[PDB]
Amino acid sequence: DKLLGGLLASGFDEDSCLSRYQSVHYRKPSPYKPSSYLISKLRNYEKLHKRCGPGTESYKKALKQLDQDGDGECKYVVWISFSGLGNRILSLASVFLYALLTDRVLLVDRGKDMDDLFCEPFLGMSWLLPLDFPMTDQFDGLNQESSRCYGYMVKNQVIDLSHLYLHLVHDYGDHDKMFFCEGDQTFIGKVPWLIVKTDNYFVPSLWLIPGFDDELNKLFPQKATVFHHLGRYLFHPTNQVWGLVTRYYEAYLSHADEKIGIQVRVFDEDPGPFQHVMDQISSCTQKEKLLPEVDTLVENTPKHKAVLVTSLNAGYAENLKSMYWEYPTSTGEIIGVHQPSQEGYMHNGKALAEMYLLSLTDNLVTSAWSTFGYVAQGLGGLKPWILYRPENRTTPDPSCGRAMSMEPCFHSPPFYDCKAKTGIDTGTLVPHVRHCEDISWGLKLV
Ligand SMILES: OC[C@H]1O[C@@H](O[C@H]2[C@@H](OC[C@H]3O[C@@H](O[C@H]4[C@H](O)[C@@H](O)[C@H](O)O[C@@H]4CO)[C@H](O)[C@@H](O)[C@@H]3O[C@@H]3O[C@H](CO[C@H]4OC[C@@H](O)[C@H](O)[C@H]4O)[C@@H](O[C@@H]4O[C@H](CO[C@H]5OC[C@@H](O)[C@H](O)[C@H]5O)[C@@H](O)[C@H](O)[C@H]4O)[C@H](O)[C@H]3O)OC[C@@H](O)[C@@H]2O)[C@H](O)[C@@H](O)[C@H]1O
Ligand SMILES: [Cl-]
Ligand SMILES: [Cl-]
Ligand SMILES: [Cl-]
Ligand SMILES: [Cl-]
Ligand SMILES: [Cl-]
Ligand SMILES: [Cl-]
Ligand SMILES: [Cl-]
Ligand SMILES: [Cl-]
Ligand SMILES: [K+]
Ligand SMILES: [K+]
């Protein structure tokens, strides 16, 4: 089923984006079926996008509100291309959900590479913000003190509204965080143009806004499927990225009975590679029976496992590779350890290819705090084993634990009760919104 259970629309040109419908020759079918209401919601999104999108007569009329109000036919939310690729992917998926919940059209700031990495997701009509949008060269300078920043208008009690800037970056404050309150969403609902900048996956705090909560439950009744569905919908790699994927997979990974992904990210100043991290990896994989122990004893048909290791430093894959070369397995399993080329013969090209290759594995080990890992697990429908974040170059004990769900984590959530107007722990409100495994103050859907 190339349409992923109805998540994807038919009718796209096959050759101009091979990944779109070929992803099925490489992936097991997801066990999570998109709800019929999410399927309607996306097919209706496409209708709206086609009516209101870039370059249409409607879009051109709405652009004049920026020089005025207005009272128009089409409203928008523009995603600003900000931060690293994994932050971008998650944040964009979040802004897309927000569009869905508010009957807005999503426009994407293409930044330096978005059109080079991704195909168009909306049948008929591009998702890219036009390059001559007049506010574009203000995007980097938009901040908490910008006149039309929502938080600035809140704290100053500004009275007038064609557009608003929503500062949702990790450094945001109390006023900016009022985005996550119902009364503020009523106000913001009236503004035809929203401009968002964020480096977080802010999905889970949408679930705690009245009104959004009812709609979200209809769309995603199993709760922890938001990124799995919206990520698969939105993001299809371009043919040159997908070539990197298919060629790697077919050469190195395709013969194995089971594929293990290991996504290594080490948040440290010094270059590496670190023994305590090597030790963490071997212990994790071996205590969870993802990879077999080796032994030095002198003294029944063999599975073949392929281990895909992604990392900035090649030492982690080398260490594992060498271990399984130099010693027999205690189980008799055949282990091959593989890592993609570090040196080129599209920096982001290879990075995206690697996230996709991880998503094609059977069991995935991720690194704590890594949005790169979140993207991979989400696209693959993998509930990972998470390598906990080390402190002071000491192997954590336990080394890893299974995640609660495949969802990504919101790293910098608000902690505010909008009704009582005071701080609250927003990870103890509803059972499906919990604190993350890897980052104790973050939130995730479970
Ligand atoms: O949403 C966060 C968002 O951040 C993006 O990255 C941006 C962010 O970087 C922060 C992290 O920097 C790392 O260092 C980088 C460095 O930026 C680069 O220059 C360098 O080349 O690479 C380095 C990595 O190799 C540090 O390793 C991190 O520590 C830092 O994360 C922040 O960590 C502190 C806590 O630090 C302690 O944790 C253990 C240990 O690792 C560290 O040394 C300790 O000191 C957090 O502060 C705590 O925050 C909590 C929660 O409060 C927040 O969230 C809830 C909201 O309501 C609050 O308003 C909000 O403040 C608070 O309760 C505690 O009191 C605080 O101590 C920070 O929250 C962590 O962010 O900023 C710089 C920018 O350059 C980066 O791009 C990242 O890419 C995104 O995925 C996402 O994580
Ligand atoms: Cl419509
Ligand atoms: Cl990244
Ligand atoms: Cl395309
Ligand atoms: Cl400023
Ligand atoms: Cl409110
Ligand atoms: Cl669902
Ligand atoms: Cl790293
Ligand atoms: Cl899994
Ligand atoms: K493209
Ligand atoms: K998979």
Curated annotation (Swiss-Prot):
Membrane-side (Lumenal) residue stretches: 1-446
Tissue-specific expression: Expressed in roots, stems, leaves, flowers, siliques and seedlings.
GO BP, one annotated term: cell wall biogenesis
UniProt-listed Enzyme Commission number(s): 2.4.1.-
List of glycosylated residues: N392
Presence of keyword Protein transport: no
Top-level EC class as recorded in UniProt: transferase
GO molecular function: fucosyltransferase activity; galactoside 2-alpha-L-fucosyltransferase activity; protein homodimerization activity
Keywords, comma-separated and alphabetical: Cell wall biogenesis/degradation, Glycoprotein, Glycosyltransferase, Golgi apparatus, Membrane, Signal-anchor, Transferase, Transmembrane, Transmembrane helix
One Gene Ontology term, aspect cellular component: Golgi cisterna membrane
Membrane topology: Single-pass type II membrane protein
Compartments, record wording: Golgi apparatus, Golgi stack membrane; Golgi apparatus membrane
Family: Belongs to the glycosyltransferase 37 family.
Summary of subunit composition and partner proteins: Homodimer. Interacts with MUR3, XLT2, XXT2 and XXT5.
Cited function: Involved in cell wall biosynthesis. Is both necessary and sufficient for the addition of the terminal fucosyl residue on xyloglucan side chains, but is not involved in the fucosylation of other cell wall components. Associates with other xyloglucan-synthesizing enzymes to form multiprotein complexes for xyloglucan synthesis in the Golgi.
Protein name, as recorded: Galactoside 2-alpha-L-fucosyltransferase
Species assigned in the record: Arabidopsis thaliana (Mouse-ear cress)
Residues of the full protein shown: 95 to 558 of 558
